[PDB]
């Protein structure tokens, strides 16, 4: 699948011979102030190989100038957090998905 | 955009979209380009919602 997920975080191969298990958990890990512990990677240099975890705290360069320790004007931090609040409806609740 | 970041250091570039380098990797067809001048004390409230 093409999108924010399954293209930079966890891409699944064409053949898999298995499936996922998903259920609603809006009280075990969802808090009124927003559970910021869960976060995703937004920006990557290229695509992701199937079944390949990638962890990196480095900044992804997004311009001509090479961003080494400066970010905000040209380059972004690749990690963005989740605003997991119970005040939303059903399209933004944290779903506990295990494959 | 190569010729974009040679116009003095900026003030604020927080974004909720795509990277400038993948703007080169993804070819577009329509972008809005509008500008205005505001006092510096009244730029911080320019945000969605």
């Amino acid at each position: 699948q093409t999108g924010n997920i399954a293209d930079y975080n966890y891409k699944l191969p064409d053949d898999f011979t298995g499936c996922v298990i998903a259920w609603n958990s809006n009280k075990l890990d969802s808090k009124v102030g927003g559970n910021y512990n869960y976060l995703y990677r937004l920006f990557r240099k290229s695509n992701l190989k199937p079944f390949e975890r990638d962890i990196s705290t480095e900044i992804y360069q997004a311009g001509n100038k090479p961003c080494n320790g400066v970010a905000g004007f040209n380059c972004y931090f690749p990690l963005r957090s989740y605003g997991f609040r119970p005040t939303y409806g059903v399209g933004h609740q944290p779903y506990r998905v295990v494959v | 955009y190569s010729v974009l970041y040679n116009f003095a250091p900026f003030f604020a570039f927080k974004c909720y979209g795509v990277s400038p380098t993948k703007l080169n990797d993804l070819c577009f067809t329509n972008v809005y380009a509008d500008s205005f001048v505001i006092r510096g004390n009244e730029v911080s409230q320019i945000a969605p919602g």
Partner: antibody
Amino acid sequence: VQLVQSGAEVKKPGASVKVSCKASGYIFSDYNIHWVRQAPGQGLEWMGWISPDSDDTNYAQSFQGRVTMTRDTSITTVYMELSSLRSDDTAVYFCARSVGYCSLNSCQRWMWFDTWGQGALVTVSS
Amino acid sequence: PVLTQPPSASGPPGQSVSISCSGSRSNIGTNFVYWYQQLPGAAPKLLIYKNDQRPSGVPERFFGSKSGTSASLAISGLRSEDEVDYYCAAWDDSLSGHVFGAGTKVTVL
């Protein structure tokens, strides 16, 4: 919400001092707490954060072995103590509650101290 | 480590004065900057969060941001509440914790 805490008084050096913070109004199961110190005429200092619903803890790179942790969920309080107090430790302590919830190392970026607790100046001398 | 700030900065009322907050490679620039003010003999409170916005109860008068490896704060109008001190705060990875500033004192002329 209101963040009353009970201070201490002058004490002999090298003893143990007990200071606690009280949580009222908001539910004390979803918000991390933060403890800071303020010497007179000196900037604030960070030590660590304590989760209310878990026994997770973390300490700074300078204050590791001289600080412990105690939780009281039924009383709905937090308990902290200082061991081997120093002469240059007469600093006011603030019970600061951070918005959101974090337990990982990298979650500290999006955290700001929303509300603060009033503190009492505790100086250790005999 | 610590953040280098001027010990004091003063200006006449009716105009705008600026406060600088320098930082290292890991202290600021790769992270977000927050500012705290404290009344004398009271508790500190939040001033600017997420580098641009302000919480409820704080008017549009307060203003602060960052450009490179340094941050700047600007105020406009010193009548009764801008005589307090200000602090510059950020996060780094060397100390694995919050590193705060030294302290900036603002008076009136």
